[PDB]
Design a protein around this ligand. Structure first.
Ligand code: MG
Ligand code: MG
Ligand code: MG
Ligand code: MG
Ligand code: ZN
Lengths: 100, 55, 49, 69, 124, 122
RNA sequence: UUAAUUGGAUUCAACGCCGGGAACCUCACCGGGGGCGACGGCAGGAUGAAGGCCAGGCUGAAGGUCUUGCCGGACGCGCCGAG
């Protein structure tokens, strides 16, 4: 009777916006929502040699990509379920909904 | 058939089974998380993919 | 040049010396190996008499 | 146990044997001679006094005197 | 002074199935035989058996340097490619279990000349 | 077939309906030249209009279609010339038999000339 | 030294460097065997171009080529430009 929502994005602000919208939707109705739980961040790190040739001192680049995640639990109520189903997420945010 | 004297064998492992999707080079291919790019090509397209040099 | 002969044809009767492939229709002609029916395209190991 | 002897599955009789002293030495010599008779690669390497098990020879395995230019 | 491989004569080795023979070879040859022969080795074996039957009175030349010597191949002469030429190999009974390429060296023996300029620190 | 084979005379209407009715059918039909190719077509009945020109010597590869005419319907006419036979339907070469199968809007004249040949000599 | 032992780099700032831990591939080297000329035009071509094959020789193995005859229908490196 509860729904679990998973959010992931490379931009922290958009994630916060979506989470706040869900929180407000839950607030505007009588329904208990477990707060947005922050899960560990994904870091993708790649180290590469700089020069195209092999002459000279060896120097390296360290490129990094970060992926932030959130978790929300809410009880399945159709009055609030439709509202969150109609929210529009930005293109850089991934959302997944499942019933437990 | 004369066209059979130009086709390559379908290898599944070895240095000849992987080519850069941007320049076609064999050798130093970055295979991390499904990327298929040379170390040369990755440096000049990394910002477009969202990578940054934080430290 | 021209290779269309060895089929016994007379004034009014046409009949072929080389049979056609049973997998295919008539008109297709086998070779004259004599040991077996070369069949031209499919081949048969029958030891033709 | 049969896997603890120093010559299992003998080349002539096919049994599992253990050898010591002179018999061991002449068995090893016979093995090397058999390799040399058929002109196998390892036999030639044994004859020339060169490494047998695929080592590199450009840098190490040097035993001699320096040659002047 | 007769030849025996594991207590068996050459004639006894002749009348053995391929699976039975593999139990006498070392581990590497047993694994290679257990995985089957490559098509090239199949053609070479067909030629060898044909020669044994009394046909194919021609030299036998091959590229298959990784073919394992079998007891039924004893008595023939095979020309194994070494990179640029085919060298003749006379198969002896004591060659059972070895690869053909072991008898066709690919490099020429080295005879050193005088060291050149730059061979030592003082010669540069 | 060949001029040195007296089958009958040279009616004008045969040429009119065998030559001047294929150009209007070339663009709305299929063409299969060659004696060897058409031989399988006529033997299996694939061809629909067999226009046999008299240009093939000797009577070696031509002595197949007349002996087989009585075996099938084989609606066939004769052509006086070969140089423009390919031009009427085909390519700029010397053609011997241009078989057109299911042509468009070339039915009445072809049927009339076929009936004329049927009542002329077969 | 070798048939070849492919090549670049020589003070710091060349020498576990070219992300170079190469069995095949990578490959650029050596021995051998095959394939490739859009588009314009020249010889030629349905009375059939260009192309493909059952078996058996040559061959390391090969319709690659040859022997043996079966295939299919519109282009054509045997020639000159060009690519
Ligand atoms: Mg060098
Ligand atoms: Mg390294
Ligand atoms: Mg290695
Ligand atoms: Mg290599
Ligand atoms: Zn690249």
């Amino acid at each position: 009777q509860k729904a679990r929502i998973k959010l992931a994005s490379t931009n922290v602000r958009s994630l916060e916006e979506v989470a706040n919208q869900i929180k407000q939707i839950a607030e505007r109705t009588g329904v208990r929502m477990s707060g947005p739980i922050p899960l560990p961040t994904k870091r993708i790190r790649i180290v590469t040699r700089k020069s195209p040739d092999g002459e000279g001192s060896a120097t390296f680049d360290r490129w990094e990509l970060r992926i932030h995640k959130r978790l929300i639990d809410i009880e399945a109520d159709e009055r609030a379920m439709r509202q969150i189903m109609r929210i529009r997420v930005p293109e850089d945010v991934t959302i997944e909904i499942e019933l437990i | 058939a004369k066209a059979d004297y130009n086709k390559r064998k379908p290898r599944k492992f070895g240095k000849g089974a992987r080519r850069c999707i941007r320049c076609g080079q064999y050798g130093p291919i970055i295979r991390i998380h499904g990327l298929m790019l040379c170390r040369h090509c990755f440096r000049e397209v990394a910002p477009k993919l969202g990578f940054r040099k934080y430290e | 040049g021209q290779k269309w002969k060895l089929y016994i044809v007379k004034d009014g009767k046409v009949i072929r010396k080389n049979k056609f492939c049973p997998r295919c229709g008539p008109g297709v002609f086998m070779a004259d190996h004599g040991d077996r029916w070369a069949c031209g395209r499919c081949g048969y190991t029958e030891w033709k008499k | 146990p049969r896997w603890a002897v120093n010559r299992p599955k003998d080349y002539e009789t096919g049994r599992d044997l253990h050898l010591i002293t002179a018999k061991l030495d002449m068995a090893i010599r016979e093995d090397i001679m058999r390799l040399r008779r058929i002109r196998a690669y390892r036999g030639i390497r044994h004859e020339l006094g060169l490494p047998v098990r695929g080592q590199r020879t450009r840098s190490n395995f040097r035993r001699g005197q320096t040659v002047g230019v | 002074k007769e030849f025996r491989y594991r207590g068996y004569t050459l004639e006894q080795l002749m009348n053995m199935s391929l699976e039975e023979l593999a139990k006498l070879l070392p581990a590497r040859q047993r694994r290679s035989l257990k995985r089957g022969l490559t098509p090239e080795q199949k053609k070479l074996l067909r030629k060898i058996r044909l020669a044994k039957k009394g046909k194919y009175n021609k030299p036998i030349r091959t590229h298959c340097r990784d073919m394992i010597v079998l007891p039924e191949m004893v008595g023939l002469t095979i020309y194994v490619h070494n990179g640029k030429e085919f060298v003749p190999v006379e198969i002896k009974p004591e060659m059972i279990g070895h690869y053909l390429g072991e008898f066709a060296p690919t490099r020429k023996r080295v005879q050193h000349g005088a060291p050149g300029i730059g061979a030592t620190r003082s010669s540069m | 077939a060949k001029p040195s084979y007296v089958k009958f005379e040279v009616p004008k209407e045969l040429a009119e309906k065998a030559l001047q009715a294929v150009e209007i059918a070339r663009d709305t039909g299929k063409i299969r030249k060659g004696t060897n190719e058409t031989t399988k077509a006529v033997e299996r009945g694939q061809a629909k209009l067999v226009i046999i020109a008299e240009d093939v010597d000797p009577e070696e590869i031509v002595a197949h279609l007349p002996p087989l005419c009585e075996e099938k319907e084989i609606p066939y006419i004769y052509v006086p010339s070969k140089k423009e036979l390919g031009a009427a339907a085909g390519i700029e070469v010397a053609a011997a038999s241009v078989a057109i199968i299911e042509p468009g809007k070339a039915r009445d004249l072809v049927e009339e000339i076929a009936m004329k040949v049927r009542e002329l000599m077969k």
